[PDB]
Amino acid sequence: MTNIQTQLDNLRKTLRQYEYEYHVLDNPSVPDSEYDRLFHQLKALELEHPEFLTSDSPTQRVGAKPLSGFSQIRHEIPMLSLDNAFSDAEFNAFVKRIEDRLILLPKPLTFCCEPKLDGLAVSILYVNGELTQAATRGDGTTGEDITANIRTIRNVPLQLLTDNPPARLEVRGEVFMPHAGFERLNKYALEHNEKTFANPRNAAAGSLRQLDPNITSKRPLVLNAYGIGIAEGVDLPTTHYARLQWLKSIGIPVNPEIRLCNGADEVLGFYRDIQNKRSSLGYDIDGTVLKINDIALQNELGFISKAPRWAIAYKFP
């Protein structure tokens, strides 16, 4: 035991906890100045005792060197996109289809309802609680390695906030740029004779395809987790909403507008409520993602790859 090792450990724990309160709970227990005091105390002590510097320390989010190019990552589990609907009647047709298709239709049929964030879909792998890799969705089978860029995102923990993390956990979510950060970015870019972005989605896409993580760090990106891919060494909750509450409880940011709704009519009320809040959210949304909450029912229903909306195979019983 040394006093330096203990001070480093204590500072790291305290800082990760403050990052959780600020970023995930939106309820910081200390002012930003106090967080920064401890942050640059940690940074200086590590630099004076580099034998104790860890790769997942709060001070190590930015790789000091730009990359040459992005490597490709093949997802172990396919990463899905979403089919869409443009009206209440079309949404009702989607529900009616599920109701007939299910072996046993529960009473009620519960949906996890989420805002549809207009950003870039990503996969972030935690091995024994440590962030080891991150990839873009790509085509759903293969994506690009954006690990270094994802590490710069302030609300993405470099380590899970739990003493018993799973052996492996893949978090899936959307990276997006809120309105305030987007407005600042364009003001700065116009002042410094640099290129402006047309909308926050383009700004987030561009920021994540940047090869220098020093540049990504200056871009105000945020993650909101919406699902789980790989999960080894953990009994994941059996409902989608509980899985999200679980990710939040171990350090992962989740959108606070998510709600449970029973049946199509309550779901359409959620859709209208979010449609009315659009103006007040502070980030861009495209619509709502409506998900069957029960995981066993998701597994039964399954997914479809490269299928026309203009044809169907009516199978014989």
Ligand X SMILES: NC(=O)n1nc(-c2ccco2)nc1N
Ligand Y SMILES: Cc1ccc(Cn2cc(C(N)=O)ccc2=O)c(C)c1
Residues taking part in catalysis: 116
Task: Tell whether residue 65 is among the known ligand binding residues.
Answer: no
Q: Are 208 and 175 in contact (CB under 8 A)?
A: yes
Rg (CA), the chain: 21
Neighbours of 32 (CB within 10 A): 11
Our finding on whether 30 is near ligand Y (CB under 6 A) is yes
- Which CB, 21 or 130, lies closer to ligand Y? 21
Q: Look at residues 60, 79, 81, 111 and name the one whose alpha carbon lies nearest to residue 258.
A: 111
Burial class (CB in 10 A: 0-12, 13-18, 19+), 143: buried
Q: Choose the contact partner of 69 out of a second copy, ligand X, ligand Y, none; CB within 5 to 8 A by kind.
A: none
Minimum CB separation of residue 257 from ligand X in Å reads: 10
Using rule CB under 6 A, residue 205 touches ligand X: no
Pick from 26, 51, 100, 163 the residue near a second copy by CB under 8 A. 100
Which of a second copy, ligand X, ligand Y, none does 93 bind, CB closer than 5 to 8 A by kind?
a second copy
Residues 247 to 276 in contact with a second copy, rule: CB under 8 A: 271, 275
User: Which of 42, 146, 252, 289 is close enough to bind ligand X by CB under 6 A?
Assistant: 289
Angle at 89 between CA 243 and CA 102, to 5 degrees: 50
Q: Is 9 in the site for ligand Y (CB under 6 A)?
A: no
Tokens (6 digits) for 148 = 């270094």
Residue 244 near residue 226, CB atoms below 8 Å:
yes
Residue 85 vs residues 118, 152, 278: alpha-carbon distances, Å: 16, 35, 18
Interacting residues with ligand Y between 137 and 196 (CB under 6 A):
154
Of 9, 83, 194, 232, the one binding a second copy (CB under 8 A) is: 83
> Do 18 and 29 meet the contact criterion of CB atoms below 8 Å apart?
yes
Which window, 29-37, 93-101, 186-194, 279-287, contacts ligand Y (CB under 6 A)?
A: 29-37
Contact residues for a second copy (CB under 8 A)? Answer: 78-87, 89-91, 93-94, 96-98, 100-101, 116, 139-141, 271, 275, 278, 285-292, 297-298, 301-317
